[PDB]
Symmetry: C4
Subunit: 91 residues, 4 copies
């Protein structure tokens, strides 16, 4: 399914960021995963990377990841959350 | 109505975040509500949660809440703010 | 015109925020205007309001202003920037 | 191509921001480029400009650049990433 592919791609993208920021920025995996998530969702509740490699990766990560992550959120909202709500609203 | 449902769902989602961050992050409700709002709107004018539970909740909260909150803002703008303005612009 | 109305509405919304944050948060107008702009565009390159009134206003300001500001940016991009670019690309 | 023009325009916009913030805010080019990218993508993982000229430029830069950058990300996602994925999903 479209949703299943987007879900997996999003997980892989977030794992990749988790590995990158935990390695290069010396973050605990949960901090690395959190940073990846608030970066790609554009929430941005975190200070900037300290290293030039962190900054370069983040620049490329944003352009590569944001379209995928927002596609996933759009399909989540449209093909999972919306039918669920409709179903919850029928007496 | 569509707007009435989205409004309520948004309020429930924000109350849920308010309860969570006031409990786990030890925030005053207004700080907890503020954090919930700038998180789900992607404004992100706030430092990150201090606890791992805060970070995990925030990650899940973002993916679950963002589509709802942006749907609400879209319906607010399109079905409430726009007709109001049109009405204000007619002599 | 649609663009002219959205432009004015956006200016009024930003003036309103500029007045609010310069008064309540004690910001210089330019700081107040900057905060209003990065808040409503969801850029969020600024620490949170210090006062509870700042936080409450910001919460309401976001939901009320974001749809207008993004409508303006959409019309700017679509009805001004895009025709300009097309025109620049014709030999 | 539409994608080729949007790509170039985005690069020019980011170069322009890189030049501006490296000059006026005294940032190393990579910091200036990073700030330009997280500003225009609305990620906002960076403190505010220190100078009034930085703040004014950033205000104008956001309204002018955000529509272009999100148009580029939309065309990247829709006309490059989506066909690539479809192609990877066919047995
Ligand atoms: K954002
Ligand atoms: K931020
Ligand atoms: K942000």
């Amino acid at each position: 399914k479209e949703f299943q592919v987007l879900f997996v791609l999003t997980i892989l993208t977030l794992i990749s960021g988790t590995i990158f920021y935990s390695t290069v920025e010396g973050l605990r995996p949960i901090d690395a995963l959190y940073f990846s998530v608030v970066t790609l969702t554009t929430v941005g509740e975190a200070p900037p990377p300290q290293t030039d490699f962190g900054k370069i990766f983040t620049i490329l990560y944003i352009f590569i990841g944001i379209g995928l992550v927002f596609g996933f959120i759009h399909k989540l909202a449209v093909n999972v959350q919306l039918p669920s709500i409709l179903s919850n609203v029928v007496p």
